Amino acid sequence: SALSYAALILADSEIEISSEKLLTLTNAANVPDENIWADIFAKALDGQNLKDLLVNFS
Amino acid sequence: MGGIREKKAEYFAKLREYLEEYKSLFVVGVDNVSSQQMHEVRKELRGRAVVLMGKNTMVRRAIRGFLSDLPDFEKLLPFVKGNVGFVFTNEPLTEIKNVIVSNRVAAPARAGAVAPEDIWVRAVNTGMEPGKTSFFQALGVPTKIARGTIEIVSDVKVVDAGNKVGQSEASLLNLLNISPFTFGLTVVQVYDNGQVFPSSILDITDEELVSHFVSAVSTIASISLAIGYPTLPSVGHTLINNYKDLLAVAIAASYHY
Amino acid sequence: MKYLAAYLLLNAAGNTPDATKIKAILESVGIEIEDEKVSSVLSALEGKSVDELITEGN
Amino acid sequence: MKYLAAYLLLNAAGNTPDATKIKAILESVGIEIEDEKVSSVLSALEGKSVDELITEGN
Amino acid sequence: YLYLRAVGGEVGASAALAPKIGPLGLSPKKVGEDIAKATKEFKGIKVTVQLKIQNRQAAASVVPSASSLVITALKEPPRDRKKDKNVKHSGNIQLDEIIEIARQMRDKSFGRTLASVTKEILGTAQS
């Protein structure tokens, strides 16, 4: 997903996963901003260990 | 053959326009490669875009640079080595290496050359009649006469990578008919667009990126499954997590329903 | 997660939607729902057979 | 990594190259791109079906 | 390779075939037949034929060749009687004739281009 890929790149670069930072990467890609989808995404990512989730999975 | 140029400043002048005509400029090593092999290798390049001349007349990339705005001086340490050419091309950097570096032709090693890789000689009958077996023994190849033929006792490494091959060593190997290396235009270097690439880059991984891609793909996939964020790939798994976890509470416990 | 369990629980009872139930369950939990997360789950749910997805386990 | 996520994100949108997008996304991240890393990823990408590589997951 | 000399149409000469050894790796008049069949028209100037030997086979590397190709096209057997100026016989090859000789040569020749190949044959033709 463009939104999931944007989150993993933002964490790899060392920058926080928020609405501004996702919006700038999303705009550079050329994909239109949709308020609901990045807002859910930041909310889903809230309270998470990105590192611990990333590795297990079937 | 006579004294007449044998040009100076004239062939440089043709060469001047040649770096400027083409985007991508390579610094390349013929030394090893035979010329049916080089000349064939060059046939490939030539259809696509072409190679031209120098000594120190080559090192004069500076004049070419001076005409434009690109390098001087500024380059890391001018990488040129014995036996260098320039390849001027349309062809992007990465592809040029795969043509040249992958497709090399074979040929024999040489006396006084540094071995590029480990050299071994096999055990079995040489097929040769009694004579100076001693020459083989001198190198540290054990041989003995079995069945009236010279045979090599065992497989062993005669020379390692990064050590020079002795003059005796080379000659004796050639008589055995043992060769083995890959020859073609070793790439020392690349210029494109203000950027300098050395040879480590130029062997261009790629399998590692597949693994990293698939792992990146799994990071995304993982994030997707666990997170619950339902565009096309993730969805059926995300629903399953909310069960995986219920079905699950049953297994440890000891209420039966 | 909150959302996943909430729609699953309703599915067992046999019925679900934005305001009527999803919002009601999470609100019964005492938690404030993010609209974007509800909207995303519902949009994903449309035209899906939840029972069939369960039948493979993963 | 930065590079991997950036081309993946673009692939989801459906399009990519050196300056136009790869450079644009990482620059949108606020990070300075190493040219050698972009060049290596692109050279590797040529003649590859990204969608097929994804279909086995590893 | 260990090389040999030949005349058009020759077989079985004592000096040329016997001391140089009979290819086929034995049994001359194997090769003596093979060279002779191939050799073409009247003897003229000697050609190289070049010997390569394999297990119970002989093979020869024979180029009279691209110039013998010129002879066929022109319908003129000699070569340039009065060198580089003007030939005694009037063998002017056409431009269409020379590119077709170049087409056929292009495998044997290295040449990059067909236009490159036309120079190489033309340079041979004039002299």
Side-chain angles (χ1 to χ4, degrees):
Chain A
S1 63
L3 296 174
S4 65
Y5 295 93
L8 295 174
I9 294 169
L10 295 174
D12 290 345
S13 64
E14 294 177 350
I15 293 169
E16 295 177 350
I17 292 169
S18 62
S19 65
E20 294 177 350
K21 294 179 179 179
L22 296 174
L23 296 174
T24 60
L25 296 174
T26 59
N27 290 337
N30 289 337
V31 174
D33 288 345
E34 290 177 350
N35 289 337
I36 294 169
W37 295 95
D39 291 345
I40 293 169
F41 297 97
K43 295 179 179 179
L45 297 174
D46 290 345
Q48 294 177 335
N49 289 337
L50 294 174
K51 293 179 179 179
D52 290 345
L53 293 172
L54 296 170
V55 182
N56 294 342
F57 287 97
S58 71
Chain B
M1 281 286 323
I4 305 189
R5 264 179 156 186
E6 294 182 353
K7 324 177 194 171
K8 281 180 177 182
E10 305 174 79
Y11 284 152
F12 296 67
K14 311 172 183 180
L15 290 165
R16 277 159 203 152
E17 296 179 1
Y18 274 80
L19 286 196
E20 300 176 293
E21 275 164 21
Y22 285 100
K23 306 170 177 179
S24 42
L25 315 176
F26 303 65
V27 197
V28 291
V30 165
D31 174 76
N32 308 315
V33 193
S34 92
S35 97
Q36 257 135 45
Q37 316 176 15
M38 262 328 306
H39 272 50
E40 292 164 3
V41 171
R42 300 151 161 171
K43 290 177 205 185
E44 301 179 8
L45 295 189
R46 289 169 187 158
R48 315 190 181 174
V50 147
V51 181
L52 302 176
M53 170 254 158
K55 330 221 184 182
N56 297 283
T57 78
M58 269 325 194
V59 180
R60 263 257 175 134
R61 309 176 176 159
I63 292 192
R64 309 187 189 115
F66 281 146
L67 290 181
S68 46
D69 294 314
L70 285 168
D72 204 19
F73 319 50
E74 291 168 78
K75 304 173 168 215
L76 297 173
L77 276 173
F79 290 66
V80 180
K81 303 178 169 176
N83 303 292
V84 150
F86 298 356
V87 178
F88 320 108
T89 23
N90 300 313
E91 301 168 60
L93 310 195
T94 56
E95 298 182 12
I96 276 181
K97 299 140 188 189
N98 298 327
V99 166
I100 298 179
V101 169
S102 94
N103 303 315
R104 273 181 180 187
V105 186
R110 301 182 194 207
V114 174
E117 292 173 2
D118 301 290
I119 302 183
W120 289 75
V121 175
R122 306 178 178 186
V124 160
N125 295 26
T126 71
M128 287 311 280
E129 292 185 11
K132 277 178 196 186
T133 53
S134 62
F135 278 146
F136 301 109
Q137 304 176 324
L139 303 189
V141 172
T143 46
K144 289 175 181 170
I145 295 176
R147 291 167 190 193
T149 44
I150 306 178
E151 310 179 359
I152 305 161
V153 178
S154 43
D155 296 55
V156 187
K157 298 183 173 174
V158 196
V159 187
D160 302 351
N163 293 333
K164 310 190 168 173
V165 176
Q167 311 186 303
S168 42
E169 296 185 304
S171 62
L172 283 154
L173 291 161
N174 299 329
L175 297 182
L176 298 175
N177 312 310
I178 295 183
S179 46
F181 305 124
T182 62
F183 296 81
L185 280 158
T186 62
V187 189
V188 192
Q189 254 201 317
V190 190
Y191 297 83
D192 221 359
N193 296 319
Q195 296 193 307
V196 188
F197 314 88
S199 47
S200 50
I201 296 191
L202 321 187
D203 296 310
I204 328 184
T205 62
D206 283 306
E207 299 180 356
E208 308 181 353
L209 289 180
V210 174
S211 67
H212 295 304
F213 293 127
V214 160
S215 63
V217 170
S218 64
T219 68
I220 291 173
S222 67
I223 284 172
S224 75
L225 306 196
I227 316 187
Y229 269 87
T231 56
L232 301 184
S234 49
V235 201
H237 307 271
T238 68
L239 308 177
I240 295 175
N241 266 260
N242 283 14
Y243 279 78
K244 282 164 200 199
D245 283 358
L246 294 168
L247 283 156
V249 178
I251 302 181
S254 51
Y255 286 91
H256 311 279
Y257 287 124
Chain C
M1 295 300 294
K2 293 176 195 184
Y3 294 86
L4 292 171
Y7 290 92
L8 294 167
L9 290 168
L10 289 167
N11 289 331
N15 295 321
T16 59
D18 276 289
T20 106
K21 301 174 176 180
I22 302 152
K23 289 181 188 175
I25 290 178
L26 312 158
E27 289 171 1
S28 76
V29 178
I31 290 170
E32 294 176 354
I33 301 172
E34 301 183 13
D35 291 346
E36 293 178 353
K37 294 179 177 168
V38 175
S39 66
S40 63
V41 175
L42 283 166
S43 61
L45 290 168
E46 295 175 355
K48 292 182 176 164
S49 43
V50 174
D51 291 345
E52 295 181 7
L53 295 173
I54 299 168
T55 59
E56 289 180 353
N58 293 119
Chain D
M1 295 300 293
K2 294 176 194 184
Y3 294 86
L4 291 171
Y7 291 92
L8 295 167
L9 290 167
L10 289 167
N11 290 332
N15 295 320
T16 58
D18 276 288
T20 104
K21 302 174 176 180
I22 301 152
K23 289 182 188 174
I25 290 178
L26 312 159
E27 288 171 0
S28 76
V29 179
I31 290 170
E32 294 177 354
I33 301 172
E34 301 182 14
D35 291 347
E36 293 178 353
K37 294 179 177 168
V38 175
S39 66
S40 63
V41 175
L42 283 167
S43 61
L45 290 168
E46 295 175 356
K48 292 182 177 163
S49 43
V50 174
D51 290 345
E52 295 181 6
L53 294 173
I54 299 168
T55 59
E56 289 181 354
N58 289 327
Chain E
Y1 329 118
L2 177 126
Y3 14 58
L4 164 59
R5 47 185 162 190
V7 204
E10 200 207 52
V11 197
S14 199
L17 280 78
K20 292 191 199 267
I21 300 176
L24 190 286
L26 260 147
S27 195
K29 220 221 149 194
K30 181 111 282 174
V31 201
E33 289 173 305
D34 291 350
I35 191 66
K37 276 153 175 193
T39 198
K40 300 183 167 65
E41 314 181 309
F42 322 122
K43 52 200 299 296
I45 185 156
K46 285 152 266 169
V47 195
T48 199
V49 315
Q50 273 172 58
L51 178 50
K52 197 179 180 172
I53 167 176
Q54 300 77 38
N55 297 143
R56 304 297 183 238
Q57 189 198 121
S61 158
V62 164
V63 162
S65 302
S67 305
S68 199
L69 321 175
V70 173
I71 278 170
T72 203
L74 285 174
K75 297 184 288 314
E76 287 270 3
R79 289 71 165 64
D80 193 340
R81 201 48 45 187
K82 186 183 192 308
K83 291 77 148 73
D84 197 75
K85 271 57 263 195
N86 191 54
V87 276
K88 176 161 294 295
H89 61 87
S90 175
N92 172 74
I93 185 168
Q94 225 172 219
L95 205 170
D96 306 295
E97 292 273 54
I98 205 169
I99 194 155
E100 300 287 295
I101 294 180
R103 190 197 177 205
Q104 186 179 326
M105 287 155 45
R106 203 163 58 149
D107 78 286
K108 209 51 173 47
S109 196
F110 196 89
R112 203 178 298 147
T113 317
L114 259 162
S116 184
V117 188
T118 47
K119 306 300 207 305
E120 302 178 36
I121 190 48
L122 191 267
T124 307
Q126 285 195 304
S127 38

